[PDB]
Every structure is written in C-alpha cells, then in structure tokens.
Design a protein around this ligand. Structure first.
Ligand code: TBJ
Lengths: 300, 237
C-alpha cells in the first residue's frame, strides 16, 4: 500500500482518486492519500471550487517512484512532483500518518471496479500517448486535443492516440474498397493489431485509457478515440473470440461506472446503436447490451 | 458543401465538374415464378456522368453480367458506380479531371469518397436539387445503346447536341432539365410533343430534334404546360 502526500491544500478543491472523490476546504489540514493499491495505474485529479472548468490530473504508478502533490500559486494548480530522497519521503509520510492527516483510499474488498477499468492500461503506454519524458507521471486535462484533432495547435501538449480513420488509404486496400469499408477486419487485424498495437492487450489499454480520460476530464477527443476503437472492432466480421468476450467485459464496467447524468455527452448514439444492433458483433456483447438497455434505453 | 438553388450558377463556371447519377445502374423487371413466388430479372443499365458546362456525357453501360452470382445488388450497384467513375477520372488527362463530382443521391457519397481516396483534392458533393436524370433512358438513342450492349462499354455523347453554338450553358442545362422533367412526369405526352411534326428531324449524329430558336420556345412552353397539368392531377389542386 502506497501513499501520495500533499504539502498543503491552499485552495478549495474537489480531489478525485480513481473513481472516488472528496471535498477539501481552503487551507484545510489535508496531507494526502494513503493505502493506494499497488499493482494498478492510478489517477489523482482536481476541480477547483472557483473554476468548474478545466478538470485536470495525473496518471501515475507508485512502483515507479515516490510522488507527492504541491500547490503552485503562480500557475494556480496542484502539481505532481517526484521526491528522489527516499529517506526524506518515508519520513514525511510516516509523520503525516502518525498525525492522521491523510484520507484512506476507500476500496471495498468485494470491489474489482478499478481493476476492471484499468486491466490493460500500462504506465509505459500512457507516457507514449502523453509525451513528457522528464516525468514518470502524466498530466491530462479537459482541454488537451488529440493528434487526429490537430490534423483537422501545440504538439507538446497533445494526446498522441493512434489515428483511426475509416475513409483513409491506411484503412482501405486498393482494389478492396467496398470489401474493406464494409468489413474492417483487415484494418483491425493486420493494420492495427498486428502492425501498430502488436497485440490486443495494448489495443484494449489505449481504449480503456481513452474512456477514463473522457469520463474524468470530459476530454472530448478521448471520447472520440474510445468510440472509434469500439466501432472498429464491432465493424469487423472476423474478430478473435477472446477479444469479443474481453470487449464485452471492458465495456460493461465502463458503462456501469459512467455517471448517469453524463450519458448524453459521453455516449455517441450512432456508434452504440450500430455496435449493439446493426454490426457484425451485435450478438457478441451480451453483458454490455443488457446494461445499456436497463440503464440508458433512451439513447437507443 | 451541398449544391442547391442558391449556388446554382457554380455549375456553369470554368471549374471542371461532373454530375453522377446512379439511378439507372441496377435495373430489374419483377415477375412471378412457376411456384408463384416473385423474382427479378436484371436488364442492362448505365451510369449517367455529365459535365453540365460542356454537355459531354460519359455513358458507362452496365451489362447484366456484372451482377452474376453477386448478393445485395442494390448496395453493390453503388460501389460499382463509384469504381467506374474513379476509373473514368483516372483515364482522363490531368487537365481534364474534375475538381468536383456532384452525386445526385447521397447514398453515393461514401462509396465514391472511398474510391476516390487517391484524389484528395476532388470534392465529392451531394445536392439538394431533385434533378430528373433518371429519365435519361427516355431518350431513344441512349436507351437503344444500353439495351443493345453485349458487354461493358463506355460511350461518349454531347447531351446538348449543338445548342451551345447559340445559347449559354445555363440555358442549355435549363432546357435539358425541362425536357427530362417532362419525360419523367409523363413520358408518352412529352415524346408526343417532341416528335408530333414529322418535318422536324433528329440528325443522325444528335439526340434531340433540329428545332429552330422559335420552335424551341414553343416546345419549352408545351413541356412547361405538361409539367404543371400533371402536377394539379397529382395533388388535386
Ligand atoms: O459521335 C458523335 N456523336 C455521338 C453519338 C452519335 C449519335 C449521337 O451521339 N459525333 C461525332 C461524329 C461527328 C461529330 C462527332
């Protein structure tokens, strides 16, 4: 169990840690988060009480270093930093725990939600989508645009998701125009899985990371990426059986965890109706279809 | 963007463009089988690809053999249309290739877009206009060449005959759309108007009769009257 200490909490802010969130008042004696489960990535995120725009936050993995949060009054935000002095860090954390100034990561034992949302997500891959190689953790916010969005303006601050475009030379083999456009199996299996992602785990990891960025930050381009990666699978007639089964589980937990109030902006009607009812895989996502129907029958 | 009444004169500027109409590509007769079920039999079709500025018509004849052993023919017909249009563009010298292709039915956008990926600078546009190009098979010499074909064939025509020697493209396209609208709304009457007078002939090298300027005015008024009457009947107004 690991810890992310906070130097202080100078401004009123709602802090999220994974799917949990807490309110912290201006100059409240709050000094961080303990009992963070090892073995998964995590995200700690922020929304200032004065500015309900720009949610922002940090993806991290405590096995990669000792990380803490410190408010910066010039840039006006809570910044993640790495403490390289391990003795100094253990000492700080032990004092803050002794003084019980830390919230406990509030995992119920029965609950695999976070594991299920992050099963394929790796820090090494996140850091290639979010390029800032001097840090071991990755900043994301509401406003960052994706590479594909940029093509259609600062590169250092972009989300470098894999570009998916169904009407592109990459997606369409010369002489298989109609075949490849109506059955995307060759774009999925040869171009994307074998060529770019190498395996389905990396594909699912990017899909899960895009969903999480959309849900936690309202990042619109991430939402586009999530739906595109779903649609590419559903629009392929030939998909390994293990991928379909795993996709059904992945999407089920994503839909289960989505705030009911955000389904309007976070779920694209066309993609979902096509995937569940028109596509090749309309009959392969039983759990996902059942939760969508019982929780969001309006969208459909 | 879409082509509509408001940007209509764009058709007659000096940027090369083509209309593509796919409504006569996949043509069938419906009939009963011995057992009393219904079956279709395909007949030859055509792609109607038209430069509205010059009148040049690229009539790609679609022989029934292209459907042999294929499923979902109405969907295939749209891709075949896009395949043949793309091949036509590739065959043209660079300075003759269109800058825009305007499809008369929106369902052609994706097939043509995908087939034209190699020409990213050719804009594929839909239109809000209700153009009567389905009536092209009411023009006798176009119907005759389609039905007689025994193999795929591309044939070049000028759908304006020599009209552009005396009138502008705008006026020529308006005459063409009026004639075709009339032929669509009541083929028998429209054809009666065009051929009533045996002394007016169709040049062996033309599609329409050799009217003088004054006779064209009379013809055009007769086609207008036809179109308006038919309409009153349609709607009981
Ligand atoms: O072939 C021409 N027209 C195309 C077809 C023939 C029947 C009507 O449509 N014309 C050429 C021959 C002399 C002028 C150029």
């Amino acid at each position: 169990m690991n810890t992310v200490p906070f130097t202080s909490a100078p401004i009123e802010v709602t802090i999220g840690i994974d799917q949990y969130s807490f309110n912290v008042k201006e100059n409240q004696p709050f000094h961080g988060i303990k009992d963070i489960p090892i073995g998964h990535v995590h995200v700690i995120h922020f929304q200032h009480a004065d500015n309900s725009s720009m949610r922002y936050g940090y993806w991290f993995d405590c096995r990669m270093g000792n990380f803490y949060i410190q408010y910066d009054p010039k840039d006006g935000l809570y910044k993640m930093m790495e403490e390289r002095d391990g003795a100094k860090f253990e000492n700080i954390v032990h004092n803050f725990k002794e003084r019980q100034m830390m919230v406990s990561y509030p995992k119920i034992d029965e609950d695999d939600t976070w594991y299920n949302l992050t099963e394929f997500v790796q820090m090494d891959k996140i850091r290639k989508i979010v390029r800032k190689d001097e840090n071991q953790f990755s900043y994301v916010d509401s406003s960052m645009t994706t590479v594909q969005e940029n093509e259609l303006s600062d590169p250092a601050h972009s989300l470098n998701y894999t570009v998916i475009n169904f009407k592109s030379r990459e997606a369409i083999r010369p002489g298989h125009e109609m075949e490849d456009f109506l059955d995307k199996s060759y774009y999925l299996n040869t171009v994307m899985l074998q060529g770019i992602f190498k395996n389905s785990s990396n594909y699912f990891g990017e899909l899960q990371f895009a969903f999480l960025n959309a849900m936690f930050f309202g990042n619109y381009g991430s939402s586009l990426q999530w739906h595109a990666m779903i649609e590419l699978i559903c629009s392929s007639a030939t998909v390994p059986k293990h991928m379909l089964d795993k996709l059904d589980e992945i999407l089920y937990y994503q839909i289960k965890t989505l705030p009911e109030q955000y389904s309007d902006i976070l779920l694209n009607e066309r993609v979902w109706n096509i995937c569940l009812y028109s596509s090749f895989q309309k009959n392969s996502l039983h759990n996902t279809e059942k939760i969508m129907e019982n929780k969001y029958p309006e969208l459909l | 963007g879409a082509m509509n009444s408001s940007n209509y004169a764009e058709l007659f500027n000096n940027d090369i463009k083509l209309f593509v109409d796919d409504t006569n590509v996949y043509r069938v007769t419906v009939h009963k089988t011995f057992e009393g079920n219904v079956a279709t039999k395909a007949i030859n079709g055509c792609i109607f690809t038209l430069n509205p500025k010059t009148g040049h018509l690229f009539l790609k004849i679609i022989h029934t053999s292209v459907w042999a052993g294929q499923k979902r023919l109405s969907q295939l017909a749209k891709w075949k249309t896009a395949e043949e249009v793309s091949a036509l563009v590739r065959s043209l010298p660079k300075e003759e290739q269109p800058k825009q292709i305007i499809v008369t039915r929106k369902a052609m956008l994706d097939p043509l877009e995908v087939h034209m990926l190699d020409f990213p600078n050719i804009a594929i546009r839909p239109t809000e206009l209700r153009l009567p190009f389905s009536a092209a098979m009411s023009i006798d010499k176009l119907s005759d060449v389609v039905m007689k074909a025994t193999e795929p064939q591309m044939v070049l025509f000028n759908i304006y005959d020599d009209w552009l020697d005396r009138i502008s493209s705008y006026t020529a396209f308006s005459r063409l759309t009026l004639l075709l609208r009339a032929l669509k709304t009541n083929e028998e009457s429209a054809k009666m108007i065009l051929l009533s007078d045996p002394t007016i002939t169709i040049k062996s090298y033309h599609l329409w009769p050799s009217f003088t300027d004054e006779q064209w005015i009379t013809i055009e008024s007769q086609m207008r009257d036809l179109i308006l009457t038919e309409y009153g009947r349609k709607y009981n107004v």
